[PDB]
Symmetry: D3
Subunit: 230 residues, 6 copies
């Protein structure tokens, strides 16, 4: 149906969990979904659809960077009529009080990208996570009683950032972590009157980089349960 | 103590409700606070401190525009050691599904101002409301069972906006309303490791402008109760 | 008539003196105007109209910041058909040769605001004071023989400026002082084919902060006489 | 060795051909390389190393978008000491005189991304292809006598571009096609004193979208031969 | 002494009149100066020094565009210790009330150039003419009783401006005319604590282009007399 | 025919060599052209037309700066129907491996100017030299066996650059030299579906400034021969 998706309308669940790593998405499909079926693998993207506790749910990779997830997210809402996209994955801690292996739920995401300024008449668009998804993710975290920090994230265009001072500036403003997609995903959801959210497990710390899967499985539990709540 | 505040450290409660209209703040102090005392009136700003259900609370005007509230907010967190600032007031509906007299709770605020880009190395800072305050405001709204829409707000520098197309662009992205301070307030709270939030009652609709105090008193109830919860 | 002015067309003189402090405006009305009448107090803005040496003249507060004065100024020219707005007030010296208590007449004003770029296709708009008003203010200063420095001003959006290097950069370019409205006022006057100007008394020095009312009364004399000349 | 590459220094040839589609890279490795060995598959990126006409050569996917290829390209030059990266792939024709199935060799690439402005003090960096690689690609095209258009490319951040007028603007300036990586790749090569180039086969036309593999195999022949020449 | 001036310190008068056309400068030197001597002709720039009513005065071309006059102006203030530069020349009327052959005295100049933003931390620098020079030029105009309009000018980087809407926007803001140097000249004078001004004769109208030398000689009279006053 | 050219269509050859210095252009016309005739001298621009090895060719000055060459270049392509403009001249070495007296052929040019962003919807336009002209210039250099470096150039708006760090940033990215026109010339050629190129002789080094005509005559030989090839 699309240049990046061979699947047809209906093959994707109304709720899709996405992570950058396509192999991670395959793993997630085999590990948590029941009767998972490969619905799209254009570009090895590993798009699957199965069920969790009886409900339809899909998992697919989204690549790295705002331009990448923007392609997939817009096609999903627009063509495959998806309603909710929960980004799942890793990120780099910024705040000194945030440590590796911690779980973070984004309320919103800043960015050094130009995409949102392009779509918003060169103004400041607040890439905000859908309050529904934020609440569902936090409640899931509370019900499962899994500690999770909630707050600002930062979607960078440069994993290897030349502006070495930015890290400290963000720490002063208490940004929790850095990843590379949220800032792009959120506004697209708004455009389609749909929902988006993000939950990540800190894989490294950018201000002083210091059992890893345990944190990941917990994050997955939260995303999954939150998906059902939604 | 400051160029805009005659009061001294301790005169202000750790939680302050602020609105643009200084007379509105005087009214709020006389109407909802017990034993309200004028603690600052530099520039007729009408800063009062009293109690609500036994707890210390202050109300003060903040003028109109990001530059204005930025002055007051930074002095409060920094000098008067305030912990929470809940902006209370009016705003203009953008979204067609939002009508005059509706109540809106901001998750965040976009802006055509340059302030946040100045403080954030010319990047996109997501002016986000403190998740605690957003939750407190929403729960108060739920407990009081008062309908309130939650979502993106927009803090403009131009009440009379030359860019007449912006209104429709924002409606496409589902921004709820427009006011003139939130985008400035939120980042300052982050800088001081403190909290900020905003709740407004739609006084007009910018896309087709269509009992007004009733909506205001309800909004005040929510802000007040949320203040206690915090 | 307007969301910020209860007065009607004709209640305001064709020449209005404005300052940020509403109480200062009340003081000015009681101290220099004859038969002053409160014509607008929406938001405690303290708008009065009286006469000086027989001629009709109004004084009103304009709040702090470009967004604030922009609201008032545009309503005045547009709705109340005002012809001349002379901003009166305080400011912070930048230039080392300018000392506290000095009087400054702005030829123009720079700014870190985005407003003028928004109204001028993202280009450099030179927020310039009306040559008539500049001349009237300087001549008044000469006739009264009151020393006054004439030159560039700077309208900041951040009273508490994070960019601490800006102050020195401006001193190198010989900006006289900093305030928070002129840059917004001037272009609006141009749009309405009307006039605007600004005269301030240095209340503090930002590069080395070092009887204060005496300087203020002198500034007021100049503004007042210049108003008559216009 | 890197967060995105499991391989070690020496596993990659000094010349690497990269395309967005990881499956395409696997295909290229199986189809044109002799004794291809998977040297990196972190994130299913499909990184192989084999030989072409006796010389060492690697092929790897780079994902979609500037942020993506920027990660891979910088790690390759920096860590794996790669000297030449030739981007191979598809693109969308812009120019009316360019038709689907045509082959294009980029002299340089424009972009709506902010990455280059971030690394170049907010100025205009001309993302230029290494003259050596451009010449090698063109000579290969001449020696093989395969028609190929040479000129400007455009690396977009938005496959689905909101600014629908851009396409025509680019056609007026005679940009040949649009893809999503070149603009990011070129400057990185410059930084490492290394080389980069790009050759694409038009898969679609954005101004009037109108046997496809034949054009692809030809493009591959050129890239491959040019690699040997380098 | 400089890469663009063969003359040495002292060869130039402290007051220099400059125009874009080098032949025009030669003409001005032969027509109004007594005992004019060629002090610099690097690049055929036609730099002369002579006397007017006994006082030392120099005239030199400055080429077209901000980058050009910026070179000459900075070398003059810095190396040749010039104190006052009065730009003399032609310009294009913008305002409908301004007609060809009219004379205009710039209070300041806007611009679509990036130079001032580069030297002013990306903010809005108000390219303002030295109040002394503006006054000297206006008084000369009054004493000679030669009608001259005073107000905003615009220094464009594009004589052939792609943005065809700008002309009307500027007419709404009442910009008097357009030329290509003032915006660059003024800030440089500020930097050197020196003076600069500009007076032009409208040679064409950009909104409806409609004896020409007569207007020029009048403009020259004003510049010359103003030079003596300074 | 134009405000800057007295000549008429046909007076200029389809190939024109341009340099900033008008006297240099006169010299070039007298030194290398046969039967050179002055076809335009508006503003002492020194525009000549003659023949080289029997073919029609014109040489004209273009002043200093992008705004300047932009005027001349656009009039030439548009009005005088010129097909190829080869910029000839001097420049300042940036790269440490480039020394005074070296010859440089630009593949493209970066810039701190705003012109290209104005004509390209505020995006990154890659000011690229026509591949034909680059090839013709390089082949001429090869056939004459005259060493010449090929690569990125930088067209500055500020000969005296306040941003002293830029020089080192450019050296890290391996920009060869700096001049003041190329970035403006290239995009104009693209707009008119015509060709442009640039070849310069390093007159100074900006990172450590260290027989000069010999290098110039060699550069001229290359430009001239390349002109014939085109
Ligand atoms: N410290 C970090 N910085 C940027 N991105 C990431 C990530 C995520 O993984 C990828 C970068 O490695 C990308 O998809 C991003 O979302 N993990 N850690 C990161
Ligand atoms: N439609 C509207 N647009 C912008 N601001 C406001 C407001 C609020 O009141 C003031 C503008 O009238 C300002 O403080 C803003 O926060 N109400 N309605 C508004
Ligand atoms: N040093 C300073 N910086 C900025 N603004 C001001 C002012 C004026 O008073 C207010 C800031 O205190 C604001 O209205 C501004 O115009 N005085 N001194 C100032
Ligand atoms: N019309 C088009 N627009 C943008 N990118 C592409 C492409 C390439 O394929 C991906 C987008 O589909 C991305 O990697 C880009 O480089 N092909 N066609 C394209
Ligand atoms: N309509 C116009 N637009 C831009 N510049 C000018 C000029 C002046 O002459 C040159 C442009 O022709 C340049 O130096 C500029 O200052 N005259 N008329 C102009
Ligand atoms: N180091 C340098 N920096 C900038 N421009 C130049 C030039 C050329 O000569 C003029 C500046 O002197 C201008 O036309 C530019 O293209 N030579 N050396 C230069």
């Amino acid at each position: 149906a699309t240049p990046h998706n061979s699947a047809q309308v209906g093959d994707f669940a109304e709720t899709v969990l996405m992570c950058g790593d396509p192999l991670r998405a395959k793993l997630i499909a085999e590990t948590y979904l029941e009767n998972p079926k490969l619905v799209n693998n254009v570009r090895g993207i590993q798009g699957y659809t199965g069920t969790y506790k009886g409900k339809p749910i899909s998992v697919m990779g989204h690549g790295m960077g705002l331009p990448s997830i923007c392609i997939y997210a817009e096609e999903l809402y627009s063509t495959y009529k998806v309603k909710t996209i929960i980004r799942v994955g890793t990120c780099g801690a910024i705040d000194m009080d945030i440590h590796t292996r911690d779980i973070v739920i984004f309320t919103s995401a800043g960015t050094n990208s130009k995409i949102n300024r392009i779509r918003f008449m060169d103004h400041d668009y607040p890439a905000t996570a859908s309050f529904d998804v934020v609440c569902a993710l936090v409640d899931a975290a509370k019900e499962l009683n899994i500690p999770a920090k909630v707050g600002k994230g930062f979607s960078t265009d440069l994993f290897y950032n030349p502006q070495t001072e930015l890290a400290q500036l963000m720490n002063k403003f208490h940004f929790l972590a850095v990843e590379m997609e949220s800032a792009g995903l959120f506004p697209i959801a708004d455009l389609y009157g749909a929902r988006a959210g993000c939950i990540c497990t800190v894989s490294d710390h950018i201000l002083h980089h210091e059992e890893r899967q345990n944190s990941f499985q917990n994050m997955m539990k939260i995303a999954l349960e939150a998906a059902i709540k939604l």
